[PDB]
Amino acid sequence: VPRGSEDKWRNAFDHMLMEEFEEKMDQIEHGLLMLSEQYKELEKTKSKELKEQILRELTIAENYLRGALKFMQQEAKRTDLNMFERYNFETAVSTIEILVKDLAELAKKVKAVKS
């Protein structure tokens, strides 16, 4: 890929990694949606085990997302990015930030269940 293109991934690892990130992102979103459903069950049952297990899964997703965030922020700062690339890294950052926010919202709710 010429260094001069502005409309594509110029590096093969960049493309491969975005692609790994996006799949991971949709999976996490889906897991969060499943945990929301489980929070609704928790609301009714008050099961200490469900509560604990939801908290554990939220903590692992959070850790992973904090890791991806750090990685993507750094990539966004690169000095050699074309517009396409910088856009993509910046959008990944925002997407992670929203997911982290949603996790933390759900965590608050779960902790608040009186089991």
Next chain:
Amino acid sequence: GLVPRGSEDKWRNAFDHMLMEEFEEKMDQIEHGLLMLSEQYKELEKTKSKELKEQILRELTIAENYLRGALKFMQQEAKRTDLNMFERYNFETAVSTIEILVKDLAELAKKVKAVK
């Protein structure tokens, strides 16, 4: 909430399971990419193309950054206080696998930089 906290033979957490499968796939991909870059290093040896050299370095640098991140992450998971045997085995193996890949990357980088 399903898997009992006393299982020793399986992932007890859904996100652990999900991310680890996703990690193994990625490792194989990175391995294949390193293999492709080695091939390209051989071409570089003959042609001495500055652009090929620069591009291989760039890709190596991106793969290294990603692998050092994954290494930090996996080391940390391996230090969890609540792991069963199956989980610890998996995290610890992931850590070793990442280390080997990082070493291979760095070896390839040395060779590339040495192309005049």
